[PDB]
Amino acid sequence: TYTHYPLHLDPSSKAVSLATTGQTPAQTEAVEAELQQLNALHRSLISLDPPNVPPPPLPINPKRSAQITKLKETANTAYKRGNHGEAVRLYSYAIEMAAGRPGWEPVNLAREELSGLYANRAQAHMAQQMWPEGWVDAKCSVESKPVGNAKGWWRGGKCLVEMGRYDEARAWIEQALGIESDGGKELAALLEEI
């Protein structure tokens, strides 16, 4: 049935470590990566609670979202002052804080939060004349949540048209208008700027 892989646990570490042998470097590196991911899973489970099982994903802890929205609010209020360095720094910090959280929690919450944070950081980059980083952040945002979002497509198209490469901008605006009302008017105005 199962293939016996000779393992060996280490005291005081609680991270299993495969003792040498599956007679092939490919299998060795595969089981090493899987073993590291299992160690990470064990660390997350022991950090969860005094018990070990993960709670169901229907209820949501509000402290994470509260801290995230407070950080986003203070970052936006600092950006409204005019400076952008500390603004983009706080944006990236909030991005890291949101993305570092466990994965058994509902995916839609983290998806929407990353969408908003990527959109805000893309706008902050657009305020700094930095076109490539703003465009890649807008691309990340639009890939996070495509529907119900238009500022992302608009900022991506603006970054493109400002930096050149009119073919990719045409394809971008084409897909945006295909998916899609201020968004429609903005897309039409940006397409007419060709």
Binding site: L7, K14, L38, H42, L45, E105, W131, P132, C140
Partner: protein
């Protein structure tokens, strides 16, 4: 009474020959249909979990790491079953056109049966560990898998900013 025994002996000979041929043919067909190359590559997380149980027996190991390995195994299994459920409709629609052989449908049915047996086994094993721990396993499994693949896609799209900045500085 040879006159009475000749026709009955004839009929018995014929019936025995047909029965033994049917039995041998069925056995050969089963032995040939139970030796088809597996559909998906061998399960690795299941092997690691079973080897962890082996080390538990032939020996101290905590109990939480077992649960983590079980969660990971369930994640791999839920990705596998999502793939098989996506492929079912396409394979069923394509089989009639004739562009696919016939052994693939048998491989698919065998893989589906094995997947059903494996998912039942894992939900039962989970039911062993924690009180009423059956469905939360798979909810956590699908959530973990989706979040992980999304995070991987995000890192992949974010690891391009360096080349983009280099290109823009070059064209400037």
């Amino acid at each position: 009474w040879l006159t009475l025994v000749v026709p009955f002996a004839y009929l018995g000979v014929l019936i025995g020959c047909l029965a033994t041929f049917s039995s041998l043919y069925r056995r050969r067909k089963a032995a040939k249909a139970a030796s088809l190359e597996p559909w998906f590559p061998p399960h690795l997380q299941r092997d690691i979990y079973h080897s962890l149980l082996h080390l538990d027996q032939q020996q101290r190991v905590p109990e939480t790491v077992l649960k983590a390995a079980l969660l990971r195994r369930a994640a791999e299994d839920i990705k596998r079953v999502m793939a098989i459920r996506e492929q079912k409709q396409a394979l069923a629609l394509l089989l009639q056109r004739g562009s696919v052989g016939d052994e693939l449908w048998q491989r698919f049915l065998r893989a589906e049966k094995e997947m059903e047996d494996e998912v039942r086994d894992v939900v039962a094993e989970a039911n062993s560990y924690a009180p009423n721990w059956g469905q939360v396993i798979f909810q956590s499994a699908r959530e973990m898998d989706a979040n992980a693949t999304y995070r991987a896609r995000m890192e992949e799209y974010q690891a391009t900013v360096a080349e983009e900045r280099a290109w823009w500085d070059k064209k400037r």
